[PDB]
Design a protein around this nucleic acid. Structure first.
Lengths: 1476, 16
RNA sequence: GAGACUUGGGCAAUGUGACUGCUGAU
RNA sequence: CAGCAGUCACAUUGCCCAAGUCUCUU
RNA sequence: GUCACAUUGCCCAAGUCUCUU
RNA sequence: GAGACUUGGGCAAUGUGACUG
């Protein structure tokens, strides 16, 4: 600020002595005691920036009032280089944590705040007390009794009594109270309080030059008569005033809580009844004291305040009483103005008439006040006027202000010079007279006075202490002086020179006033006599003084971490804790105190407590303990009360109850409850309720292992068992055309390949397979054919046949594979069946006995062909061939036989006038000398497809393949022949696409059986069932009354329960990445919506004593994808999910073939070699044929090769490379992201709710241990789940309903649902701003559940009624149909805005302007002109009213009927273009 | 009582 | 009446916390 | 996050008024 | 809960060459 | 029936922007 801050002549030695020991300074106001405190901070500014944990310290600046806190904050910010923390209640301090407190302590080197804030900071031990270098105490004269200064000062004894912070006391007046006789008996109390000696400037005479800044004003007094004369009209008005008192005593207002005297004596009237009595008593006091003209404005104040009270009244009963009081006050005003107008007939000079009427009706005291002001000012300059006027009461201030305006306006000599003002203490009265409460004046009257706008200051005792004001030139004390400190500070408020102090006294009480003033003078002179006469000695060794002074009260309580509970602070914390209970309709949230009767002291504690009072504490009806606790025997009622409160707090804390931090105890832990009541299973996976992951996709992509279905494990047949053979049917769907002759005829042939199983199979429904020619429907035989392995060689031949088929005919093989007969995971055999005896098919042993080694294509020379016999034409019909002269080993399928053609063949389109013999000599004459069998036989052939994954739907199109294709004819002896028939080859191509659906179909059947067994559905359509064929999910992008919803129709009836088709479960299994015609995604939306509804309803039913915010923030974690993943992992489901898109050539392991067993052992049992061997090492295991097909293990060379593969990876750039991506399929491992697992969870939920209804789906949700069962009763239906209480139901009877429901039938005429209990409707229409919220609540709780209800109903309707919309647009329209704006449009169209109850400034106009806008626009849905704000309340009103309608009957069908009647036009308008 | 009793204009600011 | 203490209504100042309501910006 | 405003409970210092009890003076 | 723009995989329309005579 | 190849169209998994409740 400035460098003129050089200290005064006294402050240096003061701060010098303050370092040696504790000290307290007594200097008059305006002497810079704040600056010497700042100097103390400067001297003790050595260790401020160092952290506490390293030994650093800080300081603490104690305060008294928030206004003085701001003043001292400004004073310390202006001239300090440190950082100050401005700490004030009702914000931050009650919500901060130890981290924020410590971090603020790290930066802030000094702190300022009110007393109780520091009390809570220190007792709760946010930081150690030793962390403070010094403590600065303002207004130290308050440091006595139960005042917070003394309470904090008590903490020094119990704390570490070493390296204690320094305390300094500042006060303009040392003593508060009238016990001024023998002032030495009072100084020592404050002295021993801080154990510091009082110090005052010794050189008062020389430093009085500085005291000129606080000059003593001259002291004069004005005496006025106090004759006991009162007018007639006062006696008149008192009669009806006391009549109104009596009548108000008979008022019929509602019930009120317990109210009685301080010492629990007989009852007292409630606040809403006694406030008006107190106000009228004060008005009568003002009228009697100051005069009739004073009452002429006091009455205006009474009307303008009763109007505010009427406007702020919530119950209707209070409004009538306030109207009666307003009428009575209007009558009082009428009589006052009538008396005034009956006077003033003497003169017509309006200014002079007003001045003389003010002079006349004024009491002599106020008259003397008026003429004293007139003679003191006498039309001087406004800058010469600066004063404070102190009166007793607030309404006195307002009334004196109001009459002073009129008096100033009535005198031209004072009109331009006086500008009065007034303000009062915490009881903030409106500073306006003629206007209702609409004022917003940020600058307080103190700031206005500081600006110089006002010159005369009217004020109550608020300005006597603390507030720093300009050095006023006058002080007028209108009311008699009553206390010493008030007199001292009032005389100190005339801080400037030539100031005048004027006191107004009565004539007949003048002598006693003079005597009292003289007594105060002697007391003030004797204040310094104790310090002047004090023997020069320290103030330190007398610790017993402090001990005795502080042990008189009740002993405190302490525990671990240093937390201490103050017995004097027990009442506040008890009330705070008891206010957090869920209140009833009129439940009481405060402990009930009842002093025991006289002879009941000994009934509990014995005769020893006859005089010692004992009082019991009664807990509320919803407290944790419903019993009562009794006080210890104490000598007075207040000490007994505080002891009882302290013991109750101790008992509550000893149970875990009373918050450790001594608080109403209850927050995030309420959650923790339900939380672990749920997320307890997270701990075994390394997660918790407070733990979240947001980095490196951790807990987002997890590795899983797969298990074979229950019907393929150990399915390998053995010798001497009844084996089962299920043949495969392939039904051609595409028509027989030129391009589809073979694919139809050879696929309809009886010869089929079948599976040999040691176990049974269920009935598997037909599914389509899309190939190049079109679609093929595959069905498995329902009844297997029983066969027996009658010889070991037969089984060996069958297994070799399987192995060589998989090795060659499909080329689905790898060098490191081994023919497996030991491992039982997904192990089975496939065999061909042919007619041996009758229609039944036995083993086609001709195939197995021949095709142990597939015919190896080889070149034939002319000499060999000369020795080769001529092949018959039937030797190629239906067989497989391939050309050996060409380098291509691809097979060739014989289509048409040629018995009528010669090698010198006919003409063709390309080789016109050319024969096939000439063509083959020209093209491949290099490796053919001549055709020796050049007659009577060629073959017409066509190639076969190579694709295996026949899942793509559109790969089979023929629109562009309809064009002309060449006809290909080959010469027989130049192409090598296979005895294998292409008839079986064509069907055998489709085998992997059969197996990779049979796997997951058996898995889905197992899941269906599990979810039909747990839900005890074992009825007729579930054992002799016939499964409908595979459906096609078209929406996968690969090409008045109401109709009852099908989702809920199967809830009250059992005939409508559709059997759970295996196709639905299979779709719930297959993920999006599987690249198939069906998916889980559509059912995912419905499952999610059902999960949301169930979670919201369950939480709102079990916890009807919570708020919607806590319910939402708990159901968020309950429904979060993190919860669903861990839940379904606990369900051990993931082994039965379809994610990969069936890459057969690389990753789909053959069933009965796997890599060598020793590799499995020493690469899966060893963690050090878990994923070190890469695919580059595996492919090098080109084992021998006997080493792979019979022996089953690897040789020594291969052993060294694959044991050194990992080491070679660790010695090359391949070290650290990922060897888990699609190269870990050997052990069946799969990497699946959480978005798949969760979506499958609610996909299963959606399938279950679709097929079995809401009730069975909710019952199944219990199986996933998400909806935890209640101990009293396990669970009930989704409907009839009894929920409600004091927040979902109105807490008033039927009589009070009509007073809040002005019209109900007019809402019924459009809603259509006759309410049988209007409490739900009232609770839905109750806005938070409405006054009833404090005792009844608001519509938020009903809105919370109505949202979910509407969301699920709309989602179900758009799901079932539109079968071919991707979840996208489907739920996208949902958002358009659940948007807030369209809900408001619905509300305004049906005119529900009439009945909505709310009280707010904008809200009054927003609804009207929006309904006017909608009417002008013809109810046009925005989904707009001049940015009109949408009234978001109306949408929430609908969201709560829907829930209110539902709860009145607990039926969803009626709710949906009402919703459809409401939304009929929107569900026909939005479906066209779905506006976004 | 018909009306208040008027008080003298003059007085003294006597020292106390 | 002094002194000790208590009751009850009454006055002024101080402070906490709970509940809900506006308004603007992010 | 900030501004303004409303309702209600509890806590502390001090103050006069009335009534009552004891010690004590008369 | 859903949409638009930048990266893989599947299925087509155009046209071209190779392979099947 | 298939590959090679380019132009465009269609579908699903990652990054940005924004809307509804």
């Amino acid at each position: 600020e400035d460098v003129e801050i050089k200290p005064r002549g006294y402050q240096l030695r003061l701060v010098d002595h303050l370092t040696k020991s504790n000290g307290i300074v007594y200097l008059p106001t305006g002497s810079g005691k704040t600056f010497v405190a700042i100097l103390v901070l400067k001297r003790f500014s050595q260790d401020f920036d160092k952290p506490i944990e390293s030994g650093g310290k800080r300081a603490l600046f104690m305060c008294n009032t928030v206004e003085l806190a701001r003043q001292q904050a400004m004073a310390v910010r202006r001239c300090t280089n440190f950082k100050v923390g401005f700490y004030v209640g009702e914000q931050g301090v009650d919500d901060w944590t130890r981290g924020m407190w410590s971090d603020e302590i790290k930066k802030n080197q000094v702190l300022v705040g009110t007393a109780q804030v520091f009390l809570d900071m220190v007792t709760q031990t946010y930081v150690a007390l030793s962390s403070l270098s010094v403590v600065i105490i303002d207004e130290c004269h308050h440091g006595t009794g139960h005042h917070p200064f003394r309470e904090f000062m008590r903490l020094f004894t119990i704390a570490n009594q070493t390296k204690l912070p320094r305390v300094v006391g500042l006060t303009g007046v040392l003593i508060k109270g009238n016990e001024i006789t023998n002032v030495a008996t009072k100084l020592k109390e404050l002295e021993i309080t801080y154990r510091g000696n009082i110090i005052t400037v010794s050189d008062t005479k020389e430093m009085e030059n500085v005291m000129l800044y606080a000059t003593k004003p001259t002291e004069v007094m004005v005496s006025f008569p106090h004759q006991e004369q009162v007018l007639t009209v006062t006696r008149l008005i008192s009669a009806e005033i006391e009549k109104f008192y009596v009548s108000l005593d008979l008022m019929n207002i509602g019930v009120q809580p317990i109210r009685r005297s301080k010492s629990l004596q007989c009852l007292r009237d409630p606040s809403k009844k006694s406030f008006v009595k107190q106000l009228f008593n004060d008005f009568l006091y003002q009228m009697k004291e100051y005069g009739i003209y004073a009452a002429s404005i006091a009455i205006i104040s009474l009307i303008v305040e009763f109007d505010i009270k009427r406007r702020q009244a919530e119950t209707l009963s209070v409004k009538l009483m306030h109207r009666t009081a307003l009428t009575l006050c209007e009558k009082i005003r009428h009589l006052l103005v009538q008396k005034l107008q009956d006077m003033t007939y003497d003169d017509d000079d309006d200014n002079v008439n007003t001045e003389e009427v003010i002079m006349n009706f004024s009491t002599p005291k106020v008259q003397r006040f008026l003429m004293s002001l007139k003679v003191s000012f006498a039309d001087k300059d406004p800058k010469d006027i600066c004063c404070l006027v102190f009166v007793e009461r607030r309404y006195t201030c307002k009334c004196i202000y109001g009459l002073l305006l009129n008096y100033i306006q009535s005198t031209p000599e004072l009109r331009n010079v006086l500008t009065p003002q007034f303000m009062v203490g915490r009881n903030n009265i409106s500073p306006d007279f003629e206007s209702v409460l609409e004022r917003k004046w940020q600058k307080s009257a103190i700031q206005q006075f500081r600006d110089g706008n006002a010159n005369l200051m009217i004020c109550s005792s608020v300005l006597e202490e603390g507030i720093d004001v300009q050095a006023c030139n006058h002080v007028f004390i209108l009311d008699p002086v009553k206390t010493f400190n008030m007199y001292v500070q009032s005389k100190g408020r005339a801080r400037t020179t030539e100031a005048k102090f004027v006191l107004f006294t009565a004539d007949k009480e003048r002598e006693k006033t003079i005597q009292q003033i003289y007594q105060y003078r002697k007391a003030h002179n004797d204040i310094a006599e104790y310090l002047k006469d004090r023997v020069l000695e320290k103030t330190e060794p007398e610790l017993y003084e402090i001990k005795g002074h502080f042990q008189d009260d009740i002993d405190p309580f302490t525990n671990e971490n240093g937390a201490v509970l103050l017995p004097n602070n027990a009442l506040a914390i008890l009330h705070r804790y008891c206010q957090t209970i869920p209140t009833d309709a009129f439940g009481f949230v405060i402990p009930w105190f009842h002093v025991l009767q006289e002879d009941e002291r000994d009934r509990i504690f014995g005769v020893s407590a006859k005089g010692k009072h004992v009082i019991s504490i009664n807990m509320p009806v919803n407290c944790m303990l419903r019993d009562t606790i009794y006080s210890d025997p104490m000598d007075n009622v207040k000490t007994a009360k505080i002891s009882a409160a302290f013991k109750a707090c101790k008992v509550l804390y000893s149970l875990g109850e009373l918050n450790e931090r001594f608080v109403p105890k209850t927050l995030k832990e309420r959650v923790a409850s339900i939380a672990d009541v749920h997320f307890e299973h997270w701990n075994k996976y390394g997660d918790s309720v407070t733990a979240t992951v947001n980095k490196a996709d951790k807990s987002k992509d997890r590795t899983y292992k797969t298990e074979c279905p229950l019907e393929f494990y150990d399915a390998l047949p053995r010798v001497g068992e009844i084996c089962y053979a299920y043949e495969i049917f392939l039904e051609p769907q595409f028509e027989s055309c030129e391009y589809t002759e073979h694919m139809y005829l050879n696929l309809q042939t009886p010869r089929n390949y079948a599976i040999l199983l040691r176990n049974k199979l269920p009935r598997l429904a037909e599914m389509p397979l899309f190939s190049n020619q079109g679609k093929l429907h595959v069905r498995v035989a329902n009844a297997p054919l029983e066969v027996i392995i009658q010889n070991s060689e037969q089984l060996e031949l069958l297994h070799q046949f399987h192995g060589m088929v998989f090795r060659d005919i499909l080329k689905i093989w790898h060098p490191f594979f081994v023919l497996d007969r030991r491992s039982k995971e997904n192990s089975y055999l496939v065999v061909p069946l042919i007619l041996g005896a009758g229609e039944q098919k036995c083993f086609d042993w001709e195939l197995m006995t021949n095709f142990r080694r597939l015919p190896q294509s080889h070149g034939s020379n002319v000499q060999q062909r000369e020795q080769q016999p001529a092949p018959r034409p039937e030797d190629f019909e239906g067989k497989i061939v391939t050309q050996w002269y060409a380098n291509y080993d691809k097979p060739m399928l014989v289509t048409k036989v040629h018995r009528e053609l010669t090698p010198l063949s006919y003409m063709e389109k390309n080789q016109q006038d050319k024969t096939y013999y000439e063509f083959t000599m020209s093209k491949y004459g290099n490796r053919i000398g001549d055709v020796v069998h050049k007659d009577k036989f060629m073959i017409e052939v066509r190639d076969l497809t190579e694709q295996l994954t026949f899942y793509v739907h559109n790969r089979g199109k023929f629109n562009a393949k309809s064009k002309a294709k060449m006809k290909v004819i080959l010469i027989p002896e130049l192409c090598f022949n296979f005895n294998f028939p292409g008839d079986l080859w064509l069907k055998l191509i489709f085998l992997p696409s059969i197996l990779n659906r049979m796997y997951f179909l058996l898995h889905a059947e197992a899941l269906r059986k599990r979810f039909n067994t747990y839900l005890n559905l074992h009825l007729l359509p579930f054992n002799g069932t016939d499964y409908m064929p595979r459906p096609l999910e078209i929406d996968y992008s690969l090409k008045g009354k109401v109709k009852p919803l099908l989702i809920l129709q199967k809830t009250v009836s059992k005939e409508h329960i559709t059997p759970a088709e295996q196709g639905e479960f299979l779709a719930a299994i297959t993920a999006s990445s599987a690249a198939d015609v069906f998916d889980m995604e559509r059912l995912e939306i419905l499952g999610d919506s059902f999960l949301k509804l169930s979670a919201t309803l369950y939480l709102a039913s079990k916890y009807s004593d919570w708020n919607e915010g806590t319910l939402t923030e708990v159901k968020s974690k309950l429904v979060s994808n993190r919860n669903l993943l861990f839940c379904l992992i606990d369900a051990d489901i993931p082994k039965t999910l379809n994610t990969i898109q069936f890459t057969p050539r690389y990753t789909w392991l053959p069933p009965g073939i796997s890599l060598p067993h020793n590799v499995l052992a020493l690469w899966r049992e060893n963690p050090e070699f878990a994923k070190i061997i890469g695919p580059h090492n595996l492919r090098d295991l080109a084992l021998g044929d006997e080493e792979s097909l019979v022996k089953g293990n690897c040789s020594d060379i291969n052993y060294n090769r694959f044991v050194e593969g990992c080491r070679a990876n660790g010695q090359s750039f391949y070290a650290g490379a990922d060897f888990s991506s699609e190269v870990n399929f050997c052990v069946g491992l799969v990497t699946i992201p959480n978005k798949v697992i969760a979506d499958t969870l609610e996909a299963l939920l959606g399938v279950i709710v679709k097929n079995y209804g809401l009730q069975h789906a909710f019952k199944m949700l219990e199986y996933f241990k998400i909806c935890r069962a209640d101990i009293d009763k396990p669970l009930t239906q989704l409907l009839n789940l009894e929920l409600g209480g004091k927040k979902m139901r109105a807490n008033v009877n039927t009589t009070e309903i009509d007073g809040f429901l002005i019209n109900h039938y007019y809402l019924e005429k459009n809603l259509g649902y006759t309410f049988k209990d209007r409490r739900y409707l009232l609770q839905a229409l109750t806005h938070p701003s409405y006054p009833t919220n404090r005792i009844t609540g608001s519509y938020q709780e009903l809105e919370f559940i109505g949202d979910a209800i509407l969301d699920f109903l709309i989602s179900a309707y758009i799901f079932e009624n539109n079968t071919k919309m991707n979840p996208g647009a489907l739920t996208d329209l949902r958002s358009a149909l659940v948007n807030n704006t369209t809900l408001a449009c619905i509300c305004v169209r049906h005119r529900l805005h009439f009945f909505i109850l709310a009280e707010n400034a904008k809200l009054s106009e927003i609804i009207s302007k929006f309904v006017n806008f909608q009417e002008s626009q013809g109810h046009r849905v925005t989904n707009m002109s001049t940015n009109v704000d949408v009234p978001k309340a109306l949408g929430d009103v609908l969201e709560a009213l829907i829930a209110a309608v539902y709860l009145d009957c607990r039926d969803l069908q009626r709710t949906w009927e009402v919703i459809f009647n409401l939304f009929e036009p929107e569900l026909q308008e939005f479906t066209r273009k779905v506006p976004i | 009582i018909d009306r208040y009793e008027q008080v003298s204009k003059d007085f003294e600011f006597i020292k106390i």
